[PDB]
Write a protein that binds this ligand. Structure first.
Ligand SMILES: CC(=O)N[C@H]1[C@@H](OP(=O)(O)OP(=O)(O)OC[C@H]2O[C@@H](n3ccc(=O)[nH]c3=O)[C@H](O)[C@@H]2O)O[C@H](CO)[C@@H](O)[C@@H]1O
Length: 419
């Protein structure tokens, strides 16, 4: 089992090229199940989650190839289930459900079990499907959906803002008979990306990116070529890496408009930020960051996927920073890990109260969250001495070669395989 050996402190300086969004590539890959003709998805990151998704697709009888692009041919889907072993390593597996039932009239996906960051049921996905006319049963731990003929469009109001349920419903609706309206839809840039992918295939969708999505179902979806938007979380993570190290960086292949909240908070922390059409520059001018107050919420508010990263920022900032989590109430495992490194903070309910320190100290820490745990690697970059991050497979699931990108920024980091 891999581990990172990080030697700090290091001032991060240089350039990084942002990879395609893991969170757009995922739902788009699942949506490709709908395509009758070959599809080429461009700008797909090379990460563990994509590997798992590829595996799942192949298990359905989908032909899959990859490099920068992932080539999909779902003309011969011959299997309709996502097994326990796979779903257990990737909750996003639930996304296979909707396309399968919508196109083939059947689909079975192992029901996701417990999650360390909090309660993450998929009740809304199921509800949505049912609303579309799907019959759903639970057998041997498998959620089994079925419909005789086409799904039927319906007016659905979401009890919660859900990225996942919005994708499930929107995707399945493209093949339903009639019009589907998703009210209180998630507005994430990844939702707009997936919708656009769908439309490129022949789907009829409007309102994507707003709280109200309207889908007019069609008979079949063709094929095509589609480029995945830049990864906003990867971008934010690198921006924070520079901001907490007194550094200077330029992010290439970026989409500034997906980052307003994060950029604004970085400015509050004291960063000098410039943006262009496809780039973002950040210069700390060698300054320590200033503590900020953050509240995670659905896009375009501050994203929960940047929360750990900002907690780190606050932990080495001047002042008392406060971070409140409204999406994943228990998403605080990074905190005690950071405290092992000398940080100071208290967790009261869904809020962490940070007491910024001048310097962190290297220590042994454990990764557990595919997006948040990158925080540990960042901490090692600025801590005094050696930090060893265990279980880095978690990071591998959500980031493409993060050590390589960090290394090009000046980081002293080594992938240690010897156990
Ligand atoms: C593969 C992917 O894109 N994952 C992202 C997506 O996940 P994910 O799609 O799971 O997140 P949702 O937006 O669906 O979850 C938001 C909240 O609603 C709850 N909920 C959701 C669905 C449901 O059926 N019932 C229910 O109660 C969840 O438990 C959570 O408290 O958005 C999260 C919030 O931006 C990100 O942190 C994840 O990295």
């Amino acid at each position: 089992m891999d581990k990172f050996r990080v030697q700090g402190p290091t001032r991060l300086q240089g350039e990084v090229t942002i990879s395609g969004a893991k969170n757009a590539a995922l739902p788009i890959l699942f949506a490709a199940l709908l395509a009758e003709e070959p599809v080429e998805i461009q700008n797909v990151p090379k990460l563990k989650d994509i590997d798992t998704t590829m595996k799942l697709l192949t298990q359905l009888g989908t032909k899959v190839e990859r490099x920068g692009s992932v080539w999909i041919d779902a003309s011969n889907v011959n299997n309709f289930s996502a097994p326990y072993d796979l779903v257990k390593t990737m909750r996003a597996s639930i996304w296979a459900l909707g396309p399968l039932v919508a196109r083939f009239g059947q689909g079975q996906v192992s029901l996701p079990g417990g999650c360390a960051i909090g309660a993450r049921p998929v009740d809304l996905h199921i509800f949505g499907l049912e609303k579309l006319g799907a019959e759903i049963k639970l057998e041997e731990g498998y959620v089994k959906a079925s419909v005789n003929g086409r799904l039927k469009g319906a007016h659905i109001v979401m009890d919660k803002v859900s990225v996942g349920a919005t994708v499930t419903i929107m995707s399945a609706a493209t093949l339903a008979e009639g019009t589907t309206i998703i009210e209180n839809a998630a507005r994430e840039p990844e939702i707009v990306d997936t919708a656009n992918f769908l439309v490129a295939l022949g789907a009829k969708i409007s309102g994507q990116g707003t709280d109200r999505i309207t889908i007019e179902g069609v008979e079949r979806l063709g094929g095509g070529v589609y480029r995945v938007l830049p990864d906003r979380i990867e971008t934010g993570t690198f921006l924070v890496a520079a901001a907490i190290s007194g550094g200077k960086i330029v992010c290439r292949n970026a989409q500034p408009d997906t980052l307003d909240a994060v950029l604004a908070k970085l400015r509050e922390a004291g960063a000098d930020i410039e943006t262009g059409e496809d780039w973002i520059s950040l210069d700390m001018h060698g300054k320590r960051p200033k503590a900020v107050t953050v509240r995670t919420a659905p896009h375009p508010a501050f994203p929960t996927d940047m929360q750990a990263q900002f907690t780190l920022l606050n932990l080495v900032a001047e002042g008392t920073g406060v971070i409140t989590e409204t999406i994943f109430e228990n998403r605080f495992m990074h905190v005690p890990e950071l405290i092992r490194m000398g940080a100071h903070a208290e967790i009261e309910s869904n809020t962490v109260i940070c007491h910024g320190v001048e310097k962190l100290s290297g220590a042994q820490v454990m990764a557990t969250d595919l997006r948040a745990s990158a925080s540990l690697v960042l901490a090692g970059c600025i801590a005094e001495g050696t930090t060893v991050v265990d279980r880095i497979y978690h990071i591998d699931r959500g980031y493409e070669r993060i050590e390589d990108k960090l290394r090009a920024l000046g980081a002293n980091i080594e992938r240690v395989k010897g156990e």
